[PDB]
Each structure stands twice: as C-alpha cells, then as structure tokens.
Design a protein around this ligand. Structure first.
Ligand SMILES: C[C@H]1Cc2ccccc2N1C(=O)Cc1nc(N2CCOCC2)cc(=O)[nH]1
Length: 855
C-alpha cells in the first residue's frame, strides 16, 4: 500500500478520501484481476519463468544471401563469463542449437564445469537466447547477420538465475425507462462562484434535440428539452455554457451503473475555452468537474427526484427484445462513395437515411461500412438504437487499424466501444505498442473508470513487461494533472499490485529520474554564479558522489526495457547552456565493444510533441516496409516521464550539419574552407564498398525524412536540427511544433544532392532514383491516409497546443492531397519537389547563415 503510493506518484489514501462509489468499486474489481495474475505466477516453476517474462524471439523463415554474409558458412560470436573480463572469439554453425556456444566457451576456459548449468544472455540487455531451436532461427542472431554486427553473449549460471527467480517469488508469495412518455427536464438554481446559461443534449458530435437558453440575470428555472426519457441514449452528454464566455461544464445523464440521475448535483466548471465550439457549447470537452476545492466557478443543478423507484437503462436482453419486435431501387454507387470517406467527414440527413435503409446490404456486402452505419442515426429514438445494437453483435470483427476509429469522440456508446476493443484483441503486443500512445489518451475522454479499454490495457501490460513499463510512464506523466489524477492513479495502482516483481525495476527508474530532476535544478541555480568551464566540473563532481552513482547505475532504461544502463562515463557527460539546461548522459560500454548508450534528460520543456512525431515516423517506416521499401529510418526513442520532464534516446556516432560544417578536431577538410563538408565527412569514416553503402543509406533516409517533414508539417528546419550518423543515415531531431503550427513547403538542400550524386554534377541517374524514391514513399503514405487521420483524432484529448480541434488535422489532408486523385496528388508533390530543387542553394545559404550566428 505504502510502496505503491510512492511509486505511482499519488497516495492510496487520496482515493478513499474522495468517498466516491465509482472509485471504490473499480479498485475492488481490479484487485481480483491483479491477485489472479499473482496466483498464475506461483504455479510456474524453474525455466517456465523466463519462458513467460523474457521469451526468446524466433522465426522459422530463410535468409537471403546467407553464404556471403557468413564467415565461411559459420557465425562468429564473442562470449565472456559473469566475473571474467576475458572474451572468447569462436566460430559456431548456424544450424546448431545455442547449447553449442555454452560447451565451446567452457572448454576454452578449461584449457587456459557442465554446459547445461548455463544460460545465454544478450550483451547489456535483459534478453535471453535458449531452447531446442537452431541458432539461425533466433531473432537476435538474425538481426546481427542483417546489420552485419557481431553477436555478444554473457554466460549466466543457472544458480544465479535461480537466485534471481526465487527473490522475486518471495515478493509474489508475500501477497497473501422505455415506458416513460414524459419529456426530459432539469432545474437550474444557482451559480456559486460567478464573476445566462446555455444547455443542450449531445451524443458525440450529434445534437439530440433543440438547444435551450435560460433568462438573463440565482435562476430557479425549469429547462425543458425536446426529447423524452425513453428516447435518451445510455451515453448521453448534458453540456452547459455561461455567457462573453465565463465558464463551461459537461455532465453525464446516466451514471456508471446505468441509472438515470436524480437529485441535487453540484458541477465545478472550467475557465479555459477552446477556439472551436458546437452550437455555443463544448461537447468535445471532458465530463469531469474541476478538482479545485471551493475556489473555481460552480453551477448548481437539480435532476428530477420525484420518481418512486430509480429507473436504470434497459439491459442487453431488453434491447434485442425490442429490435425483434420492430423487424417481426438500390443506389450502390452513391453508398460506396460515403463508405470510402475519411473519419473527419460529416454526414447529411439525406445521406444518413440512405445508409440506414441499406443496413442489410451494408451487413451482407461491406463489413467496412460499420463506422458510417453507426453515425447513420441521430440516437434520439429508442427504435433506431435497438435495431443498430442488434446488427452490432452479428457484425464480423473489423481489422485493428480500422477498429481504432470506433474509439474517438464520434462513438461514445459502451456496446460500440466494447466491440472496438474486441477487434483490437486480435493484434499482437508488437502491434499494440505502436498505437499505445493513442490508447492512453482515449482514457482521458472515457467518462467512467470501469470500461473495456482500461481492462484490456491492464490485461496486456501485466502479461508483457515492455507494454507494462511503457503504460506505467504514459500514466505517471499525467498523474500530477488534477483533471486525470483520479483516473490515471487507479489504473497505475492496479498494474503495480498485479506486478510486484516489476516494482523493483520501476522504483530504480523513479529514483534515477528524481536525481536527474535535482541535478537539472542545481545547474539552473549555479548558472548565474559559475562559468561554463567551472560548471562542467561541478556536474562531474556531483555525478561522482555515491548517492548519484548508485541511483543512476545498474538499472533498466525507461526508453527501452531491455537495454541496461551500466556505470556512468562521467568524463563524457555534459549539459546545454540554454535556459532549461538539458542533461546529456553517456554510459560506459562492456568487455565486447561497444557503442556507448546515451540518454538526454530534458526538464521544463514539453516532449509530448516529440513523442507523437517519432511515433508517426515509426508508423511511416512500418507502412513503407509493408510495401517492400526500407528507407533506413532512425525514429529514436522519446518518453515523457513527468510534467514537462522526459527522456530522449541518443543515436550513436551522429553529428548535426552545423557540427559537420564546423570541422571537429583536425580532419582533412581542406577542399578548401571545408567545402561540401557532408560528402567529405562520410568519406573519412567510410571507404570503398562501405562508402557506396553510406551513399545508399543517405539517399534512402533523406528521401524518407523529406516526405515525412512535408506530410507531418515539420517546420523551422536548419543545420542544428538535422543529424547524420557515421553509417550514412540522415535523421531529424528537436520536433517543437506539428502540422505547420510553428503551409510548410518541401525542403531540399545542395549538401544532400552532392552526397546522392557522389560529388559529380553530371550524375543525374543517382538523383533521378532519389526523386522517384520520394514520389514512391509519398504514394504509399496516401493509401493509409485514413489511418493517419484516425491516430490524430484520438490525440485531441492529449492537451497539445498545436492539436486542439478537428481543423488542426485538415493540414494532413492537404499535404497528402486526399481531395485530389492519385494523378493530381503526385503532380502537386512534383511541383513542390521542383520548387525545392530551384531553391536548394537558397536553403544551403539560410542553413549556413544559421551556423554563422552561433557563440
Ligand atoms: C544541442 C544538443 C547537444 C546537447 C548537449 C547537452 C544536452 C543536450 C544537447 N542537445 C540536444 O538536446 C539536441 C537534441 N538531440 C537529439 N538527439 C536524439 C538522437 O540522437 C542524437 C541526439 C534530440 C533532440 O530532440 N535534441
């Protein structure tokens, strides 16, 4: 209880202090799911623990060009023991089991023990390679061959794994209505903290009945709506606005149990108003009241309590019963158009009647019609709702990508949302992690705590630690926000109770980030007193302290749950001399190599925009690979850990265009005055065949990021926000604003063109391939246009300044040219590409001028 409180960032006593039945019932119900997960873990013993927690990834497929990629048809592996620094480099056949590495390494140690009492652990990662499967089948070995990198293994004794297993097990063991013809009416009585009130009923975006306006001024007025209690839907929204805007508040007609509310209800209104409003009201806003204890604007309203027995919404059996009581020239081309429309598009009364009349044709011929079919009714009639609900169970499961649309603002109904999550159960954990950022923000829109989405997100987080660690930080970053403090807190409590063993891993992360927050605050104060040379020494002395060293070393990274952050390389650790003073942390490598694991800590700066942009870059790279196009994208890890605080993954051996132009140390740059610095920089670290691979990796990565920055609208591009890795790969950094909210044209510079053409101006064939590559990448992105719109629609409740209303997503439709045909959309892209080429030297000047006005 006390251990959970400190970890989640909210006291468990705070939930009991609220005295709310919804909060108490959710905590009770989720405890049953948490305790059942504990009981399933104690049943499993020995090797079965690793087979569930960290299973070895394997594929039975065959690899292309296997003979040339292998060292004489054999794998070369580097292996060392837990306490021994001596690495053993030897050849192992790919067809043999991982036990062959175990026996060949112990024999080398015996010359200068049984192989069965040893397990293979991936270098600097909580990943394991074991089983009666060939070595070529394993994913870590497979990736090593493709990326050319040599596989590094650490032999961990079975007794040490047993010691790790038993210690966790001790902590796990320690857990021991429709008949009512009367119209709907509410009484407006008093506005407490006021410095007329408009009322209206909504069901997503749709207006259920005509809006009601109160007399201009204490009110004591009966506001009667043009709808009956029988016709009211389950997830009906009652919106209020005081105005000229003063205060707005939203409330639910039916509670979490499904009962029609009766009696006096106090509603704490909000001060901030959005730019876009529907009928002078905000139906897009949350139904949660202002948590400010007697300080914010309060609106007192009285629900009809004159009823003898409290009436609930009809149960599932009663809904289908009414649907059966109702039941017992076709225009296909015009229906096909409506069905093919994007999620942002609105439907007309005449269009809605067409889908409703052709509901049987929609059910039998087009399963993709359901999102449009659910919006074909106004939900202001019980007959229309019951018939639609009956068609919902007999409807086949939609693909997970199309299912995500049924979770936005347009679909508030419980049964509709229960179907959507059911379709998302079909996808794997790897697929779920891609859309995990969007699903967490849907919980903010969710009116009640106990929903199908919260139950499913917890079920997957408990079964998989990679999903679990990510969900933990997604909720903990907004746990201090009063608007979602109660909602995000109970989900965090439910996960920690069901994963007592993972709490130790999460505790080390919370403790490490707290020291980072302290170190960031110390430099902010010492900035006006100490110099740059003295300030760097002050940071090194602070990190060398026993309190800082023990807290930041030997723990799993919050960005990547596998990667282990070892001892900190104090000498390479630095900080930026900017207002927010971000920290740069470099971790020491192990006995094998290796590329030093880097992590950037940023405090005071919002990283929610960076998280969304890199998630889109990951999705773009995934959709391109499905078409058979690997553009060698580098969408690095970014995770918001707290309020205006987060972490950034460092891409090893990479420098900005500005750093490449301002030659580091003493390199042969005289070309002269470091002319065409990008090509000369790549020539220094890549020679012969490797240089050709570096040019190829540059032209593919440049093409991908040029299309990505044009589509997403990533503006303010210069020499400091574009980085180049030593392997050739080009990538964008520091994503401040999105969707042209910094409109944004296609950007291309001569520095890139010089690399693609390999220095020769008459090498048009290479640039022609790059131009067609940009054109190809843009057309693949157009096919999945509806998916990109869906993902941005679910992020409207996140609280981003650039993304507030549906009008902000309109930029994405224009950039992808979804309104134009495939022919005119490419012609629009080509026009912008040719404009970027004609302004390539102008872009080169503006970026070089930016490099000049520094220090
Ligand atoms: C200006 C650089 C140098 C520096 C020194 C100390 C602390 C922070 C930073 N900097 C940054 O914070 C820039 C910066 N770098 C980023 N990178 C992520 C990919 O690997 C390379 C680094 C991502 C990002 O959003 N911003």
């Amino acid at each position: 209880d006390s251990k959970i409180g400190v970890l989640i960032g909210k006291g468990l006593h705070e939930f009991d202090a609220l005295k709310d039945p919804e909060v108490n019932e959710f905590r009770r119900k989720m405890r049953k799911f948490s305790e059942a997960k504990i009981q399933s873990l104690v049943g499993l013993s020995w090797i079965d623990w690793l087979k569930h927690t960290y299973p070895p990834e394997h594929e039975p497929s065959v690899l292309e060009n296997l003979e040339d990629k292998l060292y004489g048809g054999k794998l070369v592996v580097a292996v060392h023991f837990e306490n021994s620094q001596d690495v053993f480099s030897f050849q192992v056949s790919p067809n043999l089991n991982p036990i062959k590495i175990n026996e060949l390494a112990i024999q080398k140690r015996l010359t200068i023990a049984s192989p069965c009492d040893y397990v293979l652990q991936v270098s600097g990662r909580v990943e394991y390679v074991f089983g009666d499967h060939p070595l070529i089948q394993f994913q870590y070995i497979r990736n090593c061959v493709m990326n050319r990198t040599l596989p590094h293994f650490i032999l961990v004794e079975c007794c040490k794994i047993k010691k790790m297993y038993e210690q966790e097990m001790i902590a796990i063991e320690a857990a021991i209505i429709w008949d009512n013809n009367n119209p709907f009416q509410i009484t407006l009585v008093k506005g407490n903290k006021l410095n007329h009130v408009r009322a209206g009923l909504f069901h997503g975006t749709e207006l259920l009945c005509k809006t009601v306006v109160s007399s201009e001024i204490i009110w004591n007025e009966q506001l009667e709506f043009d709808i009956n209690i029988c016709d009211l839907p389950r997830m009906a929204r009652l919106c209020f606005a005081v105005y000229y805007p003063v205060a707005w508040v939203n409330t639910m007609v039916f509670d979490f149990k499904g009962q029609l509310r009766s009696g006096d209800v106090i509603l704490h209104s909000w001060s901030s108003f959005p730019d876009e409003l529907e009928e002078m009201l905000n139906p897009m806003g949350t139904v949660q009241t202002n948590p400010y204890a007697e300080n914010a604007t309060a609106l007192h309203i009285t629900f009809p309590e004159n009823k003898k027995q409290p009436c609930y919404y009809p149960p599932f059996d009663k809904i289908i019963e009414k649907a059966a009581e109702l039941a017992s020239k076709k225009f296909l081309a015009v229906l096909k158009e409506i069905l093919d429309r994007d999620p942002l598009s609105q439907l007309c009364e005449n269009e809605m009647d067409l889908i409703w009349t052709l509901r049987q044709d929609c059910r039998e011929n087009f399963p993709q019609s359901l999102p449009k079919l659910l919006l074909s009714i106004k939900w202001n009639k019980l007959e229309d709702v019951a018939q639609l609900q009956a068609l919902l169970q007999i409807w086949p499961k939609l693909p997970p990508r199309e299912a995500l649309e049924l979770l936005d603002f347009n679909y508030p109904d419980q049964y509709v949302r229960e179907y959507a999550v059911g379709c998302l159960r079909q996808m794997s954990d790897e697929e779920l992690s891609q859309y995990l950022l969007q699903l967490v923000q849907v919980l903010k829109y969710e009116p009640f705590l106990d929903c199908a989405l919260s139950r499913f997100l917890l079920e997957r987080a408990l079964d998989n630690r990679r999903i679990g660690q990510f969900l933990f930080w997604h909720l903990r970053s907004e746990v201090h926000t009063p608007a979602v403090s109660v909602q995000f807190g109970v989900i965090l409590e439910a996960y920690c109770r069901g994963s007592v063993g993972h709490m130790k891993v999460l505790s080390k992360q919370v403790e490490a980030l707290n020291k980072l927050k302290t170190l960031n605050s110390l430099i902010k104060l010492n900035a006006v007193k100490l110099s740059r040379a003295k300030g760097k020494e002050a940071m090194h002395t602070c990190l060398k302290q026993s309190a800082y060293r023990e807290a930041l070393s030997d723990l799993q990274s919050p960005l990547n749950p596998c990667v282990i952050l070892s001892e900190l390389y104090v000498e390479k650790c630095k900080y930026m001399d900017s207002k927010m003073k971000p920290l740069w942390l470099v971790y020491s490598s192990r006995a094998f190599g290796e590329d030093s694991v880097g992590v950037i800590f940023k405090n005071g700066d919002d990283l929610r925009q960076d998280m969304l942009t890199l998630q889109m870059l990951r999705l773009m790279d995934l959709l391109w690979k499905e078409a058979g196009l690997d553009l060698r994208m580098l969408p690095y890890g970014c995770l918001a850990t707290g309020d205006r605080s987060g972490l950034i993954e460092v891409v090893s051996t990479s420098e900005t265009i500005a750093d490449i132009q301002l030659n580091s140390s003493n390199v042969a740059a005289t070309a002269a005055f470091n002319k065409d610095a990008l090509l000369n920089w790549l020539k220094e670290y890549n020679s012969g065949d490797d240089l050709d691979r570096a040019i190829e990796e540059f032209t593919l990565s440049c093409a991908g990021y040029c299309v990505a920055s044009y589509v997403l609208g990533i503006g303010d591009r210069h020499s400091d926000n574009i980085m180049v890795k030593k392997t050739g790969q080009l990538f964008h950094i520091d994503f401040g604003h999105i969707l042209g909210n910094f409109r944004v044209p296609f950007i291309l510079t001569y520095d890139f063109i010089h690399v693609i053409q390999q220095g020769k101006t008459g090498n048009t064939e290479k640039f022609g391939r790059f131009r067609q590559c940009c054109e190809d990448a843009y057309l693949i992105l157009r096919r999945h246009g509806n998916l990109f719109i869906t993902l941005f629609a679910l992020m409207l409740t996140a609280g981003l300044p650039e993304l507030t209303s549906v009008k902000d997503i309109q930029y994405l439709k224009d950039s992808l040219a979804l309104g134009k045909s495939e022919e005119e959309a490419l012609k629009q892209f080509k026009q912008k590409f040719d404009e970027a080429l004609r302004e390539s030297w102008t872009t080169k000047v503006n970026w070089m001028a930016h490099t000049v006005r520094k220090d």
